[PDB]
Amino acid sequence: RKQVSDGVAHIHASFNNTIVTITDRQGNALGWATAGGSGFRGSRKSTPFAAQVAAERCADAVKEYGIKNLEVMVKGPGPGRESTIRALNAAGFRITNITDVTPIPHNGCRPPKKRRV
């Protein structure tokens, strides 16, 4: 019941899952979505056409205000960097600026050895 009018939307695009939260201008949570919470779980998610149905779920929780326009914050790789923005363009929302906020360091921390099969 605040009517933020316009607020950026963060798209935490990951591999094992993807989640988009339609925060406000300053950066306050107004409504978040989630593939894991979008019916199918396990790992069936991930896929782009699976995240789209997730972020689209926001237009059902963050619609209580009246977002007439909004930007997009895509972070991290994975099947949900495009899908999300698309579903949002159809949901009825607008757009003000697309950008990738993926954490790309300068050889700072030393990543995990991991995987070796």
Partner: protein, 150 residues
């Protein structure tokens, strides 16, 4: 394997003369006793009169409408495991496939006799009933219902 020719031109119904109904009787046929097939379906096909009362002709196609799918699965030996990538179904098999469900499920109906056990199914087809109509959604719940892979 690599062979690429054409389809087997089937002989039309023993009366209405229609390939659509032709392969229909064949799919229904058994033990090469094609005769019985005709005398078993050609009857129930017209017995619709008692079930309606008019030029029972399009009823067949209309009944198949409620049994015409447009999406199926297809496991693929990829990504180490086995995919499922569902895909639609061309017309060539749409009409065909349906006919199977209409018959291959009209036999387990357990009614008076195959001759009639089949007739009723047609009425249940357009009116949604029996596994015949079931198989549709029970199949659609995969394709278009799991596009995550499609």
């Amino acid at each position: 394997r690599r062979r690429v020719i054409g389809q087997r031109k089937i002989l039309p119904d023993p009366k209405f003369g229609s390939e659509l109904l032709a392969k229909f009787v064949n799919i229904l046929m058994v033990d090469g006793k094609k005769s019985t097939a005709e005398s078993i379906v050609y009857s129930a096909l017209e017995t619709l009169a008692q079930r309606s009362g008019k030029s029972e002709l399009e009823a067949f196609e209309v009944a198949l409408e409620n049994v015409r799918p447009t999406v199926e699965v297809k496991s693929r030996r990829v990504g180490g495991s086995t995919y499922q990538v569902p895909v639609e179904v061309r017309p060539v098999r749409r009409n065909a496939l349906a006919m199977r469900w209409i018959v291959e499920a009209a036999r387990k109906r357990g009614d008076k006799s195959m001759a009639l056990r089949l007739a009723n199914e047609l009425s249940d087809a357009a009116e949604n009933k029996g596994t015949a109509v079931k198989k549709r959604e029970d199949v659609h719940r995969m394709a278009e219902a799991n596009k995550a892979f499609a």
